[PDB]
Amino acid sequence: VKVVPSMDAVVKVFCVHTEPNFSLPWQRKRQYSSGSSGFIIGGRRVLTNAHSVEHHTQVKLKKRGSDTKYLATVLAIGTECDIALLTVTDDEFWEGVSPVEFGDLPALQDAVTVVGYPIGGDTISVTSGVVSRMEILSTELLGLQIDAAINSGNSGGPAFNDKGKCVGIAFQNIGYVIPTPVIVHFIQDYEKHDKYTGFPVLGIEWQKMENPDLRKSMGMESHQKGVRIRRIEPTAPESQVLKPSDIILSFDGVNIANDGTVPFRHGERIGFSYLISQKYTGDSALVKVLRNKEILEFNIKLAIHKRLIPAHISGKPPSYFIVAGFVFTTVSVPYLRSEYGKEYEFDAPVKLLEKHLHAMAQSVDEQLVVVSQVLVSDINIGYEEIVNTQVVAFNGKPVKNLKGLAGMVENCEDEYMKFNLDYDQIVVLDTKTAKEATLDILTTHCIPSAMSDDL
Amino acid sequence: PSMDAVVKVFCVHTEPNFSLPWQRKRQYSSGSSGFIIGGRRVLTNAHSVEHHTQVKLKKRGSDTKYLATVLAIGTECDIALLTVTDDEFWEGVSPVEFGDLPALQDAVTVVGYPIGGDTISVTSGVVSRMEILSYVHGSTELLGLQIDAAINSGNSGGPAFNDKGKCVGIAFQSLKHEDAENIGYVIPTPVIVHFIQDYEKHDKYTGFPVLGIEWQKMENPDLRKSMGMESHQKGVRIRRIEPTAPESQVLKPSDIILSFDGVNIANDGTVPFRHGERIGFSYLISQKYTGDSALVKVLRNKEILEFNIKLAIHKRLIPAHISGKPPSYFIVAGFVFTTVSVPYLRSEYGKEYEFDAPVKLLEKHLHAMAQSVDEQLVVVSQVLVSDINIGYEEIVNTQVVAFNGKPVKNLKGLAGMVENCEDEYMKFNLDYDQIVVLDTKTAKEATLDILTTHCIPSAMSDDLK
Amino acid sequence: VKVVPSMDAVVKVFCVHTEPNFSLPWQRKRQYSSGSSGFIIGGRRVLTNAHSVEHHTQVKLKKRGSDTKYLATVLAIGTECDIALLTVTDDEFWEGVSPVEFGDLPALQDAVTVVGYPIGGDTISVTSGVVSRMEILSTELLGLQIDAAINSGNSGGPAFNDKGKCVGIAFQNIGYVIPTPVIVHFIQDYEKHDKYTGFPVLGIEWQKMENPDLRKSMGMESHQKGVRIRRIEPTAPESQVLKPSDIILSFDGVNIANDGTVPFRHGERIGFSYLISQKYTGDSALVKVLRNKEILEFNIKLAIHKRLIPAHISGKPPSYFIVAGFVFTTVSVPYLRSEYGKEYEFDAPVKLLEKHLHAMAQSVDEQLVVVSQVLVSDINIGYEEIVNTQVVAFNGKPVKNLKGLAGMVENCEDEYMKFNLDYDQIVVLDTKTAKEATLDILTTHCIPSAMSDDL
Amino acid sequence: PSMDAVVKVFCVHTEPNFSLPWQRKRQYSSGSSGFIIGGRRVLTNAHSVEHHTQVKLKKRGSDTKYLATVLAIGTECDIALLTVTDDEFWEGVSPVEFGDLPALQDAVTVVGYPIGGDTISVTSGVVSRMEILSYVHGSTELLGLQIDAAINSGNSGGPAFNDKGKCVGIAFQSLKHEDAENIGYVIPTPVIVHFIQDYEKHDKYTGFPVLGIEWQKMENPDLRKSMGMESHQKGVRIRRIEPTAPESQVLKPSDIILSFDGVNIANDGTVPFRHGERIGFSYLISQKYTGDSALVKVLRNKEILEFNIKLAIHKRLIPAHISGKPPSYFIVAGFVFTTVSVPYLRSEYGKEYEFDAPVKLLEKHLHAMAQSVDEQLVVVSQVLVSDINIGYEEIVNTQVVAFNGKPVKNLKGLAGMVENCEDEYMKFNLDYDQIVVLDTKTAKEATLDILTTHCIPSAMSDDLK
């Protein structure tokens, strides 16, 4: 009724996905198709969910009542906010469409309308509901809950308030709407950096300052509030300027309490990291600390977090390096999940779990390198059962990352190759016959080359 | 023919509460099986009788329960040695007599009692394999018999017989098999003989020795060549040596162990055992006695060396058990400090503690070696809530690594530093880069009223007083 | 909407509980935390549920939108009405809060609002419902039922009518509200006695007077109505003045019918004990009786009931006394429930069930003393299986209570200690070696002393 | 070889209704097993034949049912002795022959019939233990055999055979074990012999005697010393003596029973039974006959005394059963007065009456002793509603303790006081400090019309007329 003038702006999203195999990183899995929804905004752009085009090899858009599926280009994917930004090069796709208009943040129990396409259908569907809750959840972000039906094909299409105005992106009985502040940050992030970069972090771990003796011992007067820095990420800018046991008092003039919270709305507080996540990569921020009982204030340029075991790899292919059937790769969350399933946080080896939960990258290029598996062959008799075990050294030299290991192997002139592994194990191979064995092993397993292109 | 010798064991237990180490749990009574042997002795499982305050024995045909005496406990081999002063118990019973180590597929008959019943039960099966296994999880691995039968509480602790009526050992309920799998274990006669002979010679249990090394197989030919091994040589590479074992003063990492007491060790760590049978080389070590010496031949820097090594029991950083002693603890200002052992982790996190305990603690349980004889993993177990510890109430099972700048080696070390602390503040460095800071004078003064609140008799276990 | 002006008066309740072990009365169980709600009233006071602070060792309150958890003091707990009264010594907790305002008793199907905090959250939640029923239930008291959701964390927070006014205390799909009359009695009881005392009783058992021959045989004329006294509690004041077979005719001028009921509202009656429960401990009341066919009227000062097997012990620690490993304690309902579980009223020994259901205390200090268990040791060989068996005498003298038994044991100079037990059993111990054995048994079981402090 | 002697028992029962004691329940027929023995006799369970109005017997190979005669019923040992006048039943059957008391673990074969079937069934098992047990709950405990087999109705009452084809007693379906537990009982040959010899000598069943005492173990050494017991002495202390047993005139509380008929009683109440076997001393008592005398040796005030005690059957305040007699009752003004027995409680409160009956009544069931030979627990069972008893309609199973100021000793006592009451009022004192008051003249006058309403033939059972 009030949503009808924007229904011509809601498009059907056809996607072919080709997922990499993280357990066999030289393979791509079988194509599969999905259907979703999306909608046109200002500036020759289309919004949909990130999961709608995850690992896309082809995306097509079909306007309402149109007979044509236009090839689309993905401009940017925002993994943390489940948003993708699409465009279509062809001018007739855009000819005479009125884009969606956004509206104000609704309150709870407001009437909301999700408009999209059912799976297997080209005709607009329209679901009604009310905002069940509003929660900073999942980087944690604002997200609306609704008591309604997101028909899976409906995911990616717009939610409308009881005027004509868009309230966000539906995504898949209850459902969720990605709210407009999140969308705003994604769009502005893309406009600032001509790509997606994410939501910045202060790369620090902190401890509450609630105990009186702890506070007094560090020189905090009774009116001061803040959190004590436990550790700082070595790869973060902050590491040059903040120090362990600094007490963080405020961020951009916002007072941080002893439990790490800042004011949010009347009767409500939230963690100070939420404040940081509304900044943009490259912004500066004023961090005020108590250090050795003196107040210091630093201007800190915010950066994206570098995780030792990356939570994802941004659609990049996984890397690998093979010699003599030893498959080396790097540990990431998609690797752990592909190796150990949904409960990897309990089933993976404790050595890797420790690094996953507690280790910080000590340099920007540090990777956790493992022997993933050993492709059995005469050259590697007696080593076949090594699985997901860290490589810490090669012929006496520390292994920093996968490219580093590969270069050391390639340039090795000693008679033997000697890999120090975790659990105090060693692997020793005759250098000449190990390099000679590789090619036949690649053929047997249909591996296109001994290493991924990025090496 | 032998069943009169198969007694029911009634045990009263008073267990420490590892989560609340100042308490003992309610008295409770359990039943299990045991059997009469020669010399006015009864054998049963160690576990049937742990934390005993009273043990009684009942024969199948008489209502009377006889007060028994516990002579020795062998936790690692799960054997208890009992006797009974009342002679009415012994009169008219033919003791069980022991047979040779069974062959694979030999028939075995396990005689005992069901849970809650006082009637004889009889389970039958075959010896399905030899095995080196831990009878207590995380403890020293010993010879054992895997059998086709099922062993459940009640009958573990009863004797297993071969088809000639001789006893081939003590039934043992599997720790890793669901009862429906029809899989159980028999503590065999050479382990029983080791336990009894050990007690007979030393008037006490002295354990089962270990070599104190981790090893890696030498099956790859390039590995063997690069380490100078002649083509006829075989054995295993030493990965790491326990710093608290004496042999950490003569063996070295990357030595290749070739033989042990003259027995040739293969590249997979096995030695010949019997006709057509091979077993892990540790069985040569565990059949020795604590304090015995052993000839270890290694290849070091391409040369053969021979050491005679005096063998000791294994000291684990996170112990598999603490020998029925009370768990140590110490309290100041409501902070409860204790040490991490396997019973502690089981009490805190349940039977699945190898998946649900904090990864920091699991790491040390699975992989850390004690760096010194008295090293212990000290944790803040919990905080007994009070005004003195506002802001800290949620600290749980978090290692303490330093006190006012000094490393914490063990619980008694920490207890001493706290008691002799003269500084204005007590500063505990905890895991996860956390610190706890307390005013020394008020922290000590707060302790008494907190103990009163939780009915804690003493700020510390007796071993720290 | 209409409740908003009072939402700043609703607080979050954090409690650490340390429960005594009634089966091992020298032990306190492991700390556990709970979260609840509560709300501010006039006079620097906070209301919440009794179960929210049961066995508290620490209570903290957090105002709405506040960053601070203030330590609270428990002023009074009313077990029978599930109410606790809290205060906070710190003045800034009270600075500028507008307390809750109470409203009139609602009718059924009225709109009601419960305001509180979800478990794990610091943000106010608001649940709506209607009054399902109104019932004198559980001392039996008024209590409202509502068709709504009390989120467990929500228990302790206020219920509001469809004006702005408080209708009671919510407690934990249906839920209950503790109504304002109950709250009023609790507050006024606390103000009268500077503690909680409870709801007084007439300590009498009664029989209906409905049969004509029974009435005529006792001289009741056809217009007289009342109930016949069966027994009177020896420890009640009434015992000095009322007699068995008195017919109670009226209480404070309220006529009591043959079935024990009094008028309540049009078309509704209720038991006369309800009338007594709205008095206060220490009030006087006029009880009119027929005795030997004459009308007598007594002024009776009301008192709290003394139960032989107490229904609870008011947060007091359980008592115990040990000699030579014999653990003596007193039988109470928490002991019976801890020993025999939820169905103790069927699983406990019939001897104790008889006393529990039917026995009256014959003196104010009478306790039912049992051997709870025997901590096995050489000194007590042959007695190990005695469990929960009454001790009726020590060396020829009746045992009246636990303190009495302990004094007799301490002052015993005979060669032997001789305990007469129930089921015609005796326990005999050498006095000297039994006293000498105790200490080692206390050590083995980690018992701090042979008796609880109250002895 | 013996199975032709194993007969099916068809019984017609006419049971009293204990809840409505003026009624008999509908006639119904049940099947069970029995077997032919020597002397033109058949044995079966007493319970298979209780309240019999007709019993028939069927052999396995013939359609014909033979009218049987019930010679004697032994409720306590659950044995019935039958015979059959028609000689066609007896012709060509070899009677069952009895064997000696089995040893533990001996094989037993139980021959009978399934429920509803007339084909032979055969169950096998082992003698798992000797036992002293009640065959009727709350009744006198007797020797019994526990067996590994399962006994269910149909087959109880069939014979149990040892491996030499001899009968070792009568199968008995357990009262305390669920049928899936594969646990049953055999009434053994010395109990059968006692029953048969008893009938043969006295022309009737005379029961199994008891001593009429409760006792406490003397295992604590301080207890024994304080009572003057020399170190070689052992036995049990008398807690309480039945006031209705003759021996309440010679034994005393706190006597220590040392021996019975010269057999030495231990501190746990056991006596030697066979090689390696001990049993409770009551088996010496129950194998005697009612009226036999027994030598009881006690320690009293540190001196040995010896009594020869004439033994009688046990009189229980709340009887375990009433010997197939009709339950007594008496009615006035609609009040139904009856006595409390175990069948009454079972009829009123179901199989779980030990948990669901009023605690007052349970107390007396479990712990009260009759204070006199004719004492009974008298209750108002119910009130047959009428104008005369307005206000009392809900009184249920509440003891009557006095009538117009005089104690109620038993039902006939109360019936007499009511009938001879000349006072204006009848005043019944009931439990829970309640009184019932009725006008004597109108109460008596109301009774007839109430009986008519409920079709009650008579205001009282015949035993009160």
Q: Which residue of C has its CA nearest to A264?
A: C65
Mention every residue, 6+ apart, whose C-beta is less than 8 A from residue C22: C318, C332, C334, C335, C337, C338, C339
Q: Which residue of A has its CA nearest to B355?
A: A346
D413 forms beta bridges with none
d(CA B22, CA B463): 12
How many domains does chain C fold into?
2
Do residues C214 and C320 both lie within one domain? no
Residue C358 backbone dihedrals phi, psi, to 5 degrees:
-130, -15
Element (H, E) at C443: helix C431-444
Rounded to the nearest angstrom, the minimum Cα separation between C196 and chain B is: 23
- Residue B140 CB neighbours (<10 A): 22
For residue B439, which residues of chain A lie inside 8 Å, CB to CB?
213, 216
Do residues C223 and C330 both lie within one domain? no
In this structure, what token pair is assigned to residue D352?
A: 């779980």
SS3 at position C135: strand
In this complex, do A267 and C67 lie within 8 Å of one another by their Cβ atoms?
no
d(CA B179, CA B150): 7
* CA distances from residue C245 to C202, C234, D344, D389, D427 in whole angstroms, order as listed: 15, 15, 32, 20, 13
Rounded to the nearest angstrom, the minimum Cα separation between D213 and chain C is: 12
What is the sign of the dihedral through the CA atoms of D116, D122, D127 and D130?
positive
d(CA C185, CA A232): 58
In this complex, do B14 and C445 lie within 8 Å of one another by their Cβ atoms?
yes
Nearest to C337 by CA among C323, C322, C352: C352
Mention every residue, 6+ apart, whose C-beta is less than 8 A from residue B21: B326, B327, B328, B329, B336, B338, B381, B461
Element (H, E) at C330: strand C326-330
* CA distances from residue C300 to A155, C200, C231, C410 in whole angstroms, order as listed: 75, 12, 17, 41
Do residues C68 and C209 both lie within one domain? yes
DSSP state of D265: P
For testing contact with chain D, the best of C323, C383, C424, C432 (most D CBs within 10 A): C424
In this structure, what token pair is assigned to residue D271?
A: 């006596």
Nearest to B447 by CA among B329, B325, B326, B348: B329
In this complex, do B63 and D270 lie within 8 Å of one another by their Cβ atoms?
yes
d(CA C186, CA C172): 20
Q: Which residue of A has its CA nearest to B352?
A: A346
In this complex, do B4 and D146 lie within 8 Å of one another by their Cβ atoms?
no
Task: Give chain A as a 3 state SS string.
Answer: CCCHHHHCCEEEEEEEECCECCCCCCCECCCEEEEEEEEEECCCEEEECCCCCCCEEEEEEECCCCCCCEECEEEEEEHHHCEEEEECCCHHHHCCCCCCCECCCCCCCCEEEEEECCCCCCCCEEEEEEEEEEEEECCCEEEEEECCCCCCCCCCCEEEECCCCEEEEEECCCEEEEEHHHHHHHHHHHHHHCCCCCCCECCEEEEECCCHHHHHHCCCCCCCCCEEEEEECCCCHHHHCCCCCCEEEEECCEECCCCCEEEEECCEEEEHHHHHHCCCCCCEEEEEEEECCEEEEEEEECECCCCCCCCCCCCCCCCCEEECCEEEEECCHHHHHHHHCCCHHHHCCHHHHHHHHHCCCCCCCCCCEEEEEECCCHHHCCCCCCCCEEEEEECCEECCCHHHHHHHHHCCCCCEEEEEECCCEEEEEEHHHHHHHHHHHHHHCCCCCCECCCC
For testing contact with chain B, the best of A204, A208, A209, A213 (most B CBs within 10 A): A213
Contacts 24+ apart (CB under 8 A), D168-171: D168/D98, D168/D99, D168/D100, D168/D101, D168/D102, D168/D108, D169/D145, D170/D43, D170/D44, D170/D45, D170/D78, D170/D79, D171/D33, D171/D110, D171/D112
Task: Give D49-66 as a 3 state SS string.
Answer: HCCEEEEEEECCCCCCEE
In this structure, what token pair is assigned to residue A2?
A: 């009030």
d(CA D463, CA D460): 8
A144 forms beta bridges with A134, A177
For residue C445, which residues of chain B lie inside 8 Å, CB to CB?
14, 24
* CA distances from residue C59 to A396, C46, C62, C70 in whole angstroms, order as listed: 59, 12, 10, 8
- Residue A309 CB neighbours (<10 A): 19
Which positions in chain D have a beta carbon within 8 angstroms of at least one beta carbon in chain B? Answer: 104-105, 128-130, 146, 148, 266, 268, 270, 273-280
Residue that is written with structure tokens 């407001």 in the block: A110
Which residues does a gap of C–N over 2.5 Å follow in chain A?
138, 172
Task: Give D379-400 as a 3 state SS string.
Answer: EEEEECCCHHHCCCCCCCCEEE
For testing contact with chain A, the best of C67, C97, C151 (most A CBs within 10 A): C67
Do residues D168 and D202 both lie within one domain? yes
Do residues A360 and A231 both lie within one domain? no
Q: What does the longest C-alpha to C-alpha distance in chain A come to? A: 79
Q: Which residue of B has its CA nearest to A418?
A: B223
Q: Which residue of C has its CA nearest to B454?
A: C28
For residue B363, which residues of chain A lie inside 8 Å, CB to CB?
350-351, 354
Q: Which of C17, C34, C51, C185 is catalytic?
A: C51
- End of a domain among A288, A305, A322? A305
What is the DSSP annotation of D66-122?
EEEEEEEEETTTTEEEEEES-GGGTTT-PPP-B-PPPPTT-EEEEEE--TT--S-EE
In this structure, what token pair is assigned to residue D23?
A: 């009624």
Residue that is written with structure tokens 């007599």 in the block: B97
- Residue A398 CB neighbours (<10 A): 9
For residue A430, which residues of chain B lie inside 8 Å, CB to CB?
222, 225
R_g over Cα of chain A: 26
Residue D138 backbone dihedrals phi, psi, to 5 degrees:
75, 5
Rounded to the nearest angstrom, the minimum Cα separation between D359 and chain C is: 6
Q: Are A34 and A48 in contact (CB under 8 A)?
A: no
Do residues C48 and C118 both lie within one domain? yes
In this complex, do C428 and D366 lie within 8 Å of one another by their Cβ atoms?
no
Q: What does the longest C-alpha to C-alpha distance in chain C come to? A: 79
Q: Which residue of A has its CA nearest to C67?
A: A257
Q: Are D356 and C343 in contact (CB under 8 A)?
A: no
Do residues C337 and C247 both lie within one domain? no
Q: Are A34 and A50 in contact (CB under 8 A)?
A: no
Neighbours of chain B (3+ CB pairs under 8 A): A, C, D
Q: Which residue of D has its CA nearest to B113?
A: D128
What is the DSSP annotation of D340-361?
--HHHHHHHH-TTHHHHS-HHH
In this complex, do C58 and B386 lie within 8 Å of one another by their Cβ atoms?
yes
d(CA A221, CA A210): 12
Per-residue b or e along A410-445, where b marks 16 or more CB atoms closer than 10 Å to that residue's CB:
eebeeebbbbbbbebbbbbbbbeebbebbeebbeee
- Domain of residue D381: give its range: 315-465
Do residues B148 and B249 both lie within one domain? yes
- Residue D287 CB neighbours (<10 A): 17
* CA distances from residue C404 to C321, C397, C428, D107, D185 in whole angstroms, order as listed: 11, 10, 18, 59, 50
Q: Decide: C and D in contact? Rule: 3+ Cβ pairs under 8 Å.
A: yes
Mention every residue, 6+ apart, whose C-beta is less than 8 A from residue D206: D198, D289, D290, D291, D313
By annotation, the residues of B acting in catalysis are 47, 78, 156
Which residues does a gap of C–N over 2.5 Å follow in chain C?
138, 172
Do residues D304 and D450 both lie within one domain? no
Residue C79 backbone dihedrals phi, psi, to 5 degrees:
-60, -45
Closest Cβ–Cβ partner in B64, B92, B120 for D105: B120
SS3 at position D453: helix
Residues in chain C: 455
Q: Which CATH number is B396's domain given? A: 3.20.190.20
R_g over Cα of chain B: 25
A328 forms beta bridges with A321, A371
What sections of B185-294 are H helices per DSSP? 189-202, 221-226, 282-286
Residue that is written with structure tokens 């340039």 in the block: A411
Do residues C216 and C341 both lie within one domain? no
Closest Cβ–Cβ partner in C16, C445, C448 for B24: C445
For residue A268, which residues of chain C lie inside 8 Å, CB to CB?
65, 122-123
Q: Are D168 and D161 in contact (CB under 8 A)?
A: yes
Number of H helices, E strands in chain C: 10, 28
Neighbours of chain D (3+ CB pairs under 8 A): B, C
In this complex, do C350 and D360 lie within 8 Å of one another by their Cβ atoms?
no
Do residues B350 and B300 both lie within one domain? no
In this complex, do A214 and B363 lie within 8 Å of one another by their Cβ atoms?
no
Closest Cβ–Cβ partner in B61, B118, B119 for D277: B61
- Residue C313 CB neighbours (<10 A): 17
In this complex, do C446 and B24 lie within 8 Å of one another by their Cβ atoms?
yes
D47 is catalytic: yes
Mention every residue, 6+ apart, whose C-beta is less than 8 A from residue D461: D21, D22, D326, D327, D328, D329, D330
What is the sign of the dihedral through the CA atoms of A172, A174, A176 and A177?
positive
Per-residue b or e along D37-69, where b marks 16 or more CB atoms closer than 10 Å to that residue's CB:
beeebbbbbbbbbbebeebbbbbeeeeeebebe
In this structure, what token pair is assigned to residue B219?
A: 């099956």
- End of a domain among D266, D293, D314? D314
DSSP state of B417: H
What number of C-beta contacts closer than 8 Å exist between B and D?
38
For testing contact with chain C, the best of D215, D220, D366 (most C CBs within 10 A): D220
* CA distances from residue D323 to A136, C153, D326, D435, D453 in whole angstroms, order as listed: 79, 63, 9, 33, 31
**Residue D344: alpha-carbon gap to chain centroid:** 13
Q: Are D96 and D2 in contact (CB under 8 A)?
A: yes
d(CA A355, CA A361): 10
Do residues B266 and B362 both lie within one domain? no
C155 is catalytic: yes
Residue D186 carries which side chain, given as an amino acid letter? V
- End of a domain among B294, B314, B334? B314
d(CA C11, CA C23): 36
d(CA D44, CA C235): 60
For residue D222, which residues of chain C lie inside 8 Å, CB to CB?
416, 428-430, 433-434
In this complex, do D276 and B61 lie within 8 Å of one another by their Cβ atoms?
yes
For testing contact with chain C, the best of D256, D356, D433 (most C CBs within 10 A): D433
d(CA C410, CA D334): 59
